[PDB]
Amino acid sequence: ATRAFSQIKDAMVFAFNLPAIVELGTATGFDFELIDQAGLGHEKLTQARN
């Protein structure tokens, strides 16, 4: 499905399988969170994330 869906224009479409236990997120990788602790705003936060 992913191979046959990459040719669809004007759409980013993916297909995948549910994890082993669908009650918490997948245990692969890390979940980083950038945090504003001074009141910079949304623009500065997006710039820092980029």
Place this chain on the structure above:
Amino acid sequence: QMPAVGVVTVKTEPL
């Protein structure tokens, strides 16, 4: 590979 996009030609029209 080579990505493909859908394009539209532009021409002046009177309205």
